[PDB]
């Protein structure tokens, strides 16, 4: 049932990726720098979720 | 340890215990053989005398 | 009665997690098993001298 | 977050032979990271409300 | 399922323990028979001398 | 479930049929275990006589 | 002798646990009935607003 | 309070369930004698038992369950006797203020206020 | 990966040489140093993204 | 085999109650938008307020039915989530009790159908009221 990185952590030798969340499962980018912050200014339209 | 290593450790213990039981069983059968051969030998020499 | 005492001890050992108890029946059965073993040993000694 | 992470620490008092890492360790650390992420996104959206 | 596997291994251990106790008291019985037979073999030596 | 929702579906008939089968199943398994231990007692009862007469 | 006294000692505790679960059910059922009385009061105060 | 009652009912019943397990096995335990069948050599058993408690703590555990369960039940009794009283207060106060408004009118209002919930509808009967 | 492979390979030795020598001490120091360094690198990447 | 068959029966009944829940939610949203439209045209007036008083009661009764379907869906999902070696597995007392409600399937369907037919009749009568009020003003 477990995917393959969690299988190779149950092996003897350490061929695994050191960072625990996998690439193919995590929706967010790892250590990505972009984050859209909209400054609240009276007037124009505010919005959310510019990443997706 | 990994669970396969843990399970193989406990089966190695169980196989060692089974091996030692086998050695004791063979030893006790040979004790009975030594007893019957020894008794027959002494009585045969007794009757020759 | 060795068979009876051992089977009673086994069925009492297959008990759930809180009802498994240091019981009066447990002390009586332990004394019974010890007494039966000593009596069997004395009976075997009498057989050998016979 | 309470129940999962104290489940982790109340597990990890184990002795030497069974001090291991099964799937429960990996599923529990994934649990606590994703619950933490849910806390941050709900806090941010409460602030915007 | 982890604690169920632990229970299965415990049952295997106690099976081998029961067989092991049966072996060791059988072998003590055979040993005391051997000692009694040894003294009984010792006496006709005195007779022959 | 509350007052309008106790519906008495197919699931309640299925569950009572499973329980009603299950006491008979466990009873038959205990009966066969008792039969097997009786058989083991009889085999010991003749093994003793063979071992003595040898 | 001892098994009978342990049997009836446990039979007592089984009996008043048997009574207490029925008591809690018959309490909480009337608690639900009062909550059902409480809901339509909120409805019949929503109208006059 | 409904959910808390439900939880404590499950706790007390699970205690009763393990006691039913022990009562089920002691009844088969007592019916063994020296003549009848179903006996085998179980050699480690007298040597290697392990126990968890004493019969005093076996009693004390279910005293604590019944104590907490009855405290919870009486707290539910307290709240169910508060709810009906405050609902009577709400019904009386609304009917009083409506009558005061009608007296003010006397000193579209007829055609609207001619429909109104009564005391039994404010109570929910 | 290289260090853990050295650990299992040197642990697969035979009976009159299964010795806790200085090599195993240095291999354990290697495993500890590698994991500390890469976790420090993880936190530094987080701060540089922030 | 009997365990997996009962898995199948519970999953089927969760789907067939989710159908009624989502259609109740659709009718709820439609009725709220309709009350807003009728109140805007209010802003014959006596007949209109009588119609508002008649639409409101069906709105709360359908709200009650919708919440009941929410709770049924949640606890039946819990029933499907229960399997072997779950923690809260218990040897119950008297599991074959007829519940105190004793409600059959046909009644359980026709009550919600009664609610829906009353709601749709109220909607069409209010549509007639809307066109009559516009005609009167002009």
From Swiss-Prot, chain A:
Signal peptide: none annotated. It is found in: Cytoplasm, Cytoskeleton, Cilium axoneme; Cytoplasm, Cytoskeleton, Flagellum axoneme. Transmembrane segments: none annotated. Microtubule inner protein (MIP) part of the dynein-decorated doublet microtubules (DMTs) in cilia axoneme, which is required for motile cilia beating. Located at the center of the tektin bundle where may function to recruit tektins or stabilize the bundle. Microtubule inner protein component of sperm flagellar doublet microtubules. This is Tektin bundle-interacting protein 1. The chain holds residues 104 to 155 of 206 of the full protein.
UniProtKB/Swiss-Prot annotation, chain B:
Expressed preferentially in testis. Expressed predominantly in late pachytene spermatocytes and early round spermatids. Expressed in spermatozoa. N- and O-glycosylated. Ubiquitinated, leading to its degradation. Deubiquitinated by USP16, promoting its stability. Signal peptide: none annotated. Disruption phenotype: Sperm with reduced motility (47%) and forward progression and increased flagellar structural bending defects. However, normal fertility is maintained. Microtubule inner protein (MIP) part of the dynein-decorated doublet microtubules (DMTs) in cilia and flagellar axoneme. Forms filamentous polymers in the walls of ciliary and flagellar microtubules. Required for normal sperm mobility. Belongs to the tektin family. This is Tektin-3. It comes from Mus musculus. The chain holds residues 295 to 343 of 490 of the full protein.
From Swiss-Prot, chain H:
Microtubule inner protein component of sperm flagellar doublet microtubules. This is Tektin-4. Ubiquitinated, leading to its degradation. Deubiquitinated by USP16, promoting its stability. It comes from Mus musculus (Mouse). Disruption phenotype: In a 129S5/SvEvBrd genetic background, males show progressive reduction in fertility with almost complete loss of fertility after 5 months of breeding. Testis weight and histology appear normal. Spermatozoa have significantly reduced forward motility. The sperm flagellum shows defective bending in the midpiece region which impairs waveform propagation and forward propulsion. Sperm ATP levels deplete significantly over time, probably as a result of excess energy consumption from inefficient flagellar beating. Microtubule inner protein (MIP) part of the dynein-decorated doublet microtubules (DMTs) in cilia and flagellar axoneme. Forms filamentous polymers in the walls of ciliary and flagellar microtubules. Contributes to normal sperm motility. One of its GO terms (biological process) is flagellated sperm motility. The keyword Ubl conjugation applies. The chain holds residues 200 to 446 of 447 of the full protein. It is found in: Cytoplasm, Cytoskeleton, Cilium axoneme; Cytoplasm, Cytoskeleton, Flagellum axoneme. Belongs to the tektin family. The keyword Ubl conjugation applies. One of its GO terms (cellular component) is sperm flagellum. Keywords: Cell projection, Cilium, Cilium biogenesis/degradation, Coiled coil, Cytoplasm, Cytoskeleton, Flagellum, Ubl conjugation.
Curated annotation (Swiss-Prot), chain J:
Microtubule inner protein component of sperm flagellar doublet microtubules. May interact with CCDC172. Belongs to the tektin family. Expressed in the testes (at protein level). This is Tektin-2. It comes from Mus musculus (Mouse). Microtubule inner protein (MIP) part of the dynein-decorated doublet microtubules (DMTs) in cilia and flagellar axoneme. Plays a key role in the assembly or attachment of the inner dynein arm to microtubules in sperm flagella and tracheal cilia. Forms filamentous polymers in the walls of ciliary and flagellar microtubules. The gene is Tekt2. Ubiquitinated, leading to its degradation. Deubiquitinated by USP16, promoting its stability. Tyrosine phosphorylated. It is found in: Cytoplasm, Cytoskeleton, Cilium axoneme; Cytoplasm, Cytoskeleton, Flagellum axoneme; Cytoplasm, Cytoskeleton, Microtubule organizing center.
């Amino acid at each position: 049932g477990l995917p393959p990185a969690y299988t190779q952590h149950l092996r003897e030798m350490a061929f695994w990726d050191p960072a625990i969340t996998a690439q193919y499962l995590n929706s967010g980018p790892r250590w990505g720098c972009m984050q859209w912050r909209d400054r609240q200014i009276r007037g124009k339209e505010f919005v959310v979720t510019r990443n997706q | 340890s990994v669970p396969e290593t843990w399970a193989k450790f406990t089966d190695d213990n169980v196989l060692r215990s089974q091996s030692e039981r086998a050695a004791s069983a063979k030893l006790r059968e040979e004790t009975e053989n030594l007893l019957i051969v020894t008794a027959n030998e002494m009585w045969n020499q007794f009757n020759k005398v | 009665p060795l068979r009876v005492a051992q089977t009673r001890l086994y069925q009492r050992s297959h008990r759930p997690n809180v009802e498994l108890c240091r019981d009066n029946a447990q002390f009586r059965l332990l004394s019974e098993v010890e007494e039966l073993n000593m009596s069997l040993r004395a009976l075997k000694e009498k057989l050998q001298d016979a | 977050l309470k129940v999962a992470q104290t489940r982790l620490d109340e597990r990890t008092r184990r002795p030497n032979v069974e001090l291991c890492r099964d799937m429960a360790q990996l599923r529990l650390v994934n649990e606590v990271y994703e619950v933490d992420e849910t806390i941050q996104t709900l806090q941010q959206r409460l602030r915007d409300s | 399922e982890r604690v169920n596997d632990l229970a299965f291994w415990k049952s295997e251990i106690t099976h081998e323990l029961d067989e092991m106790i049966g072996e060791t008291n059988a072998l003590t019985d055979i040993k005391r028979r051997l000692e009694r037979g040894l003294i009984e073999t010792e006496g006709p030596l005195q007779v022959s001398r | 479930r509350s007052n309008v929702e106790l519906c008495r579906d197919q699931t309640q008939y299925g569950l009572i049929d499973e329980v009603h089968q299950l006491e008979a199943t466990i009873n038959t398994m205990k009966q066969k275990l008792a039969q097997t231990q009786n058989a083991l007692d009889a085999l010991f009862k003749h093994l003793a006589r063979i071992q003595a007469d040898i | 002798r001892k098994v009978g006294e342990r049997l009836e000692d446990m039979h007592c505790w089984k009996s008043e646990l048997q009574r207490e679960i029925d008591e809690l059910s018959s309490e909480t059922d009337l608690m639900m009935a009062q909550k059902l009385r409480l809901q339509r009061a909120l409805d019949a105060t929503s109208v006059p607003y | 309070q409904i959910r808390l009652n439900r939880e404590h009912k499950e706790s007390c019943e699970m205690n009763w369930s393990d006691k039913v397990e022990v009562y089920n096995i002691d009844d088969t335990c007592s019916r063994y004698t020296n003549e009848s069948t179903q006996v085998q050599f179980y050699p480690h058993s007298s040597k290697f038992e392990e126990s968890a408690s004493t019969p005093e703590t076996w009693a004390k555990f279910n005293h604590d369950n019944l104590l907490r369960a009855e405290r919870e039940r009486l707290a539910s009794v307290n709240l169910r006797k508060l709810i009906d009283c405050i609902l009577r207060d709400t019904a009386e106060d609304l009917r009083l203020q409506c009558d005061a408004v009608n007296s003010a009118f006397s000193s579209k209002c007829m055609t609207h206020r001619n429909r109104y919930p009564s005391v039994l509808q404010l109570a929910g009967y | 990966s290289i260090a853990t492979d050295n650990l299992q390979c040197r642990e697969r030795r035979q009976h009159p040489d299964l010795v806790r020598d200085y090599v195993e001490v240095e291999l354990l120091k290697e495993t500890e140093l590698i994991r500390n360094i890469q976790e420090l690198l993880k936190r530094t990447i987080g701060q540089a993204v922030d | 085999w009997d365990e997996h068959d009962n898995r199948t029966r519970l999953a089927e009944r969760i789907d067939t109650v989710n159908r009624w829940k989502e259609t109740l939610d659709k009718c709820l949203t439609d009725l709220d938008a309709e009350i807003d439209s009728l109140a805007q045209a209010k802003e014959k007036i006596s007949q209109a307020f009588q119609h508002l008083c008649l639409l409101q009661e069906i709105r709360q009764q359908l709200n009650s039915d919708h919440r009941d379907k929410m709770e049924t869906l949640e606890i039946d999902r819990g029933c499907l989530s229960l399997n072997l070696t779950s923690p809260n597995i218990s040897l119950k007392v008297n599991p074959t009790r007829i519940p105190k409600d004793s409600t059959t399937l046909q009644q359980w369907d026709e009550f919600t159908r009664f609610n829906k037919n009353r709601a749709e009749a109220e909607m069409k009568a209010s549509i007639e009221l809307r066109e009559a009020i516009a005609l009167a003003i002009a």
